[PDB]
């Protein structure tokens, strides 16, 4: 699959707004993920013990991981599909060290779309959401292919 330049522009336009507050979006996205799919929280040994949203909002460790995740995703999106080099180390750590199934990448993709829809209605209309979904689908498809090559695929 391949996105058009127009689709990439819609993706990068809303991402530019996300970059105005990376830490804030990072918290919102991870917390959305953990509330919608509690099982994903078990993968984060640092704060698997958090019980409530209030505790999650106060966690500096969660906020830092959110920034790290979004910054890595932003770098990938900015490559507009030419992200082979960026995906290699990410695929290896998440497949071999963290053991993150593709299902969880789908879950976080859903959280990203939910938060952008909530915080940026003016720049996340139907066409923009479709472009973002297409970009995330491409990311998941390529990461899944790498998982397979690495011996994980799951
Ligand atoms: C948007 C997709 C994601 C991106 C771009 C991303 C990016 C990153 C980055 C850059 C790191 C630090 C370097 C590394 O270990 O590779 C990291 C660590 C990690 N990621 Fe992801 N990640 C994503 C999704 C997920 C998901 C869905 C989970 C599991 C629910 C997850 C769990 C972890 C864990 C457990 C760590 C290690 C944290 C620690 O113990 O310090 N990641 N991720």
Curated annotation (Swiss-Prot):
Q: Which residues carry this modification: Phosphothreonine?
A: 68
Checking Pfam families in the record gives: Globin
Q: Where does O2 bind?
A: 65
EC annotation? Answer: 1.7.-.-, 1.11.1.-
* Biological process according to GO: removal of superoxide radicals
Q: Where is the Globin domain?
A: 2-148
Q: Which residues carry this modification: Phosphoserine?
A: 4
Judged by the first EC level, this protein's enzyme class is oxidoreductase
Q: Which GO terms describe its molecular function?
A: heme binding; metal ion binding; nitrite reductase activity; oxygen binding; oxygen carrier activity; peroxidase activity
Q: State the InterPro entries in the record.
A: Globin (IPR000971), Globin-like_sf (IPR009050), Myoglobin (IPR002335)
**Name listed for the protein in its UniProt record:** Myoglobin
Q: Which organism is it from?
A: Physeter macrocephalus (Sperm whale)
């Amino acid at each position: 699959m391949v996105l058009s330049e127009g689709e990439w522009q819609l993706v990068l336009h809303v991402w530019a707004k996300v970059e105005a507050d990376v830490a804030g979006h990072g918290q919102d996205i991870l917390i959305r993920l953990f509330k919608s799919h509690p099982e994903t929280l078990e993968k984060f040994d640092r704060f698997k013990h958090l019980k409530t949203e209030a505790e999650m909002k106060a966690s500096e460790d969660l906020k830092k991981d959110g920034v790290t995740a979004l910054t890595a995703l932003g770098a990938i999106l900015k490559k507009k599909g030419h992200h082979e080099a960026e995906l290699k180390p990410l695929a290896q750590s998440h497949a071999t060290k963290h053991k993150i199934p593709i299902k969880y990448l789908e879950f976080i993709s859903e959280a990203i779309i939910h938060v952008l829809h909530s915080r940026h209605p003016g720049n996340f209309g139907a066409d923009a959401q479709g472009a973002m979904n297409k970009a995330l689908e491409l990311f998941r498809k390529d990461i899944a292919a790498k998982y397979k090559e690495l011996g994980y695929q799951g």
